[PDB]
Amino acid sequence: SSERIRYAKWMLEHGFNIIPIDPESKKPVLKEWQKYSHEMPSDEEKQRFLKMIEEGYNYAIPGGQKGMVIMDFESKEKLKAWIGESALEELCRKTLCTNTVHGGIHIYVLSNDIPPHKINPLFEENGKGIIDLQSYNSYVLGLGSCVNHLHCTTDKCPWKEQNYTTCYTLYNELKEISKVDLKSLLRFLAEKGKRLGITLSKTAKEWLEG
Ligand SMILES: [Zn+2]
Ligand SMILES: [Zn+2]
């Protein structure tokens, strides 16, 4: 059927919980969705969730689950200039990467050492955050979810008030979320970005240096 339901089922198939997003509130259908970073909803809730998604609801994937976190970059073209085409392609060759509805890129990874607390933004350029690590108490919309930008009136949306719809799509091809050495990755990004005005945030460098 739809890509939205296919990918939602694919995440569940791999042991990751998902939660429907209410069409109106644009927030998870359950207020206490954070519990899904540590336990499953059970057969009942699951079927109910899948029905909402099949009927058209978008869905989200809570971070932190089984050591899975999502590096949420605001701009894909910026990352390409940042680490280079070769580095980006290799990274997305080894793990799942997706295009966001605003031109960003989500890189899903598994890590044995997840920050015990929020250290966002990870990096900044010209005094502003350009990437956030989505871990516990956060989520990202999943593949197939679509957003109509007509109601977006902030400068965070490039498509401000446009009668235009975009969706979360695969960067290249569907691939398993694989393990990465998070701290080693961040050091690579730090080294590559210094010559482009991209630097780690105070809290990020803190954790990175222990
Ligand atoms: Zn928007
Ligand atoms: Zn698999």
Side-chain angles (χ1 to χ4, degrees):
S1 49
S2 73
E3 299 169 87
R4 193 182 57 266
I5 188 64
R6 140 59 157 175
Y7 295 123
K9 290 184 175 183
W10 184 80
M11 269 294 279
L12 290 168
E13 186 192 324
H14 297 78
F16 298 100
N17 302 310
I18 65 180
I19 186 173
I21 294 292
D22 183 277
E24 303 157 52
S25 72
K26 297 185 177 179
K27 297 181 177 184
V29 299
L30 294 174
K31 178 72 175 184
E32 68 314 304
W33 59 267
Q34 295 88 170
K35 62 186 178 185
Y36 291 136
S37 60
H38 289 290
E39 65 178 51
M40 291 182 272
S42 84
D43 297 308
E44 288 199 304
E45 304 186 67
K46 289 186 179 181
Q47 300 308 308
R48 193 188 93 196
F49 288 171
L50 283 180
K51 190 170 184 180
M52 284 175 256
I53 299 177
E54 284 185 297
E55 296 179 64
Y57 285 24
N58 283 333
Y59 67 99
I61 301 163
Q65 306 187 53
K66 299 173 181 177
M68 193 270 276
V69 296
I70 309 89
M71 302 180 268
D72 184 358
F73 299 80
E74 292 185 310
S75 164
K76 178 177 65 182
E77 298 203 309
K78 188 173 187 180
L79 179 57
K80 187 176 192 178
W82 186 344
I83 62 178
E85 307 181 302
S86 290
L88 181 59
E89 294 305 311
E90 185 49 64
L91 183 51
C92 295
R93 173 191 177 185
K94 65 179 182 180
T95 198
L96 183 65
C97 294
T98 71
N99 293 303
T100 73
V101 299
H102 298 129
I105 177 167
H106 284 170
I107 303 188
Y108 294 65
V109 303
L110 295 184
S111 174
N112 291 289
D113 197 299
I114 303 304
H117 50 300
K118 293 183 184 294
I119 58 173
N120 295 323
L122 287 186
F123 298 78
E124 303 176 60
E125 186 198 64
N126 191 57
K128 299 182 176 184
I130 58 172
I131 184 281
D132 292 298
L133 177 63
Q134 311 292 30
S135 190
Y136 303 106
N137 298 342
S138 65
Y139 63 74
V140 295
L141 297 200
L143 283 163
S145 297
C146 300
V147 179
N148 172 91
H149 310 284
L150 258 181
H151 307 298
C152 302
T153 184
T154 67
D155 299 310
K156 294 190 174 183
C157 174
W159 325 125
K160 178 179 178 179
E161 289 166 50
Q162 300 174 193
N163 196 334
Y164 179 58
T165 295
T166 56
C167 315
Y168 284 77
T169 60
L170 288 165
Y171 171 73
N172 48 196
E173 288 103 309
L174 181 64
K175 291 170 175 177
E176 206 88 358
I177 294 174
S178 69
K179 299 181 179 180
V180 300
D181 187 305
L182 192 58
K183 287 183 177 177
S184 293
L185 174 63
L186 297 182
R187 299 200 202 83
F188 175 66
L189 289 175
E191 299 172 299
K192 279 281 191 173
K194 200 60 180 179
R195 51 195 181 181
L196 296 175
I198 300 173
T199 307
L200 287 157
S201 70
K202 291 186 177 180
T203 300
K205 190 172 182 183
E206 178 75 59
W207 180 71
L208 188 53
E209 306 183 312

Short mmCIF file of all heavy atoms in Angstrom, two decimals, residues 10 13-14 176, ligand 2:
data_model
loop_
_atom_site.label_atom_id
_atom_site.label_comp_id
_atom_site.label_asym_id
_atom_site.label_seq_id
_atom_site.Cartn_x
_atom_site.Cartn_y
_atom_site.Cartn_z
N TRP A 10 7.93 -1.37 8.91
CA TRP A 10 9.34 -1.72 8.85
C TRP A 10 10.05 -1.37 10.16
O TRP A 10 10.88 -2.14 10.66
CB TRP A 10 9.99 -1.00 7.67
CG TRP A 10 11.41 -1.36 7.45
CD1 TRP A 10 11.90 -2.47 6.83
CD2 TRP A 10 12.54 -0.59 7.85
NE1 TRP A 10 13.27 -2.44 6.81
CE2 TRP A 10 13.69 -1.29 7.43
CE3 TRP A 10 12.70 0.63 8.51
CZ2 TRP A 10 14.98 -0.82 7.66
CZ3 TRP A 10 13.98 1.11 8.74
CH2 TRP A 10 15.11 0.38 8.32
N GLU A 13 8.92 -3.79 12.75
CA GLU A 13 9.52 -5.08 12.41
C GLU A 13 10.91 -5.21 13.01
O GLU A 13 11.35 -6.30 13.38
CB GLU A 13 9.60 -5.22 10.88
CG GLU A 13 10.07 -6.58 10.39
CD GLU A 13 10.42 -6.59 8.90
OE1 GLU A 13 9.75 -5.88 8.12
OE2 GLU A 13 11.37 -7.31 8.52
N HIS A 14 11.62 -4.08 13.10
CA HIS A 14 12.96 -4.09 13.65
C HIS A 14 13.06 -3.78 15.14
O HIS A 14 14.13 -3.45 15.64
CB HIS A 14 13.86 -3.16 12.84
CG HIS A 14 14.01 -3.61 11.42
ND1 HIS A 14 13.03 -3.41 10.47
CD2 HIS A 14 14.96 -4.36 10.82
CE1 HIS A 14 13.37 -4.02 9.35
NE2 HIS A 14 14.54 -4.60 9.54
N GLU A 176 19.38 -0.80 6.99
CA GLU A 176 19.31 -1.07 8.42
C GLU A 176 19.97 0.06 9.22
O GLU A 176 20.95 0.64 8.77
CB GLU A 176 20.06 -2.37 8.72
CG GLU A 176 19.59 -3.09 9.95
CD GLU A 176 18.46 -4.03 9.65
OE1 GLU A 176 18.03 -4.06 8.47
OE2 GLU A 176 18.01 -4.74 10.57
ZN ZN B 2 16.36 -5.57 8.85
#
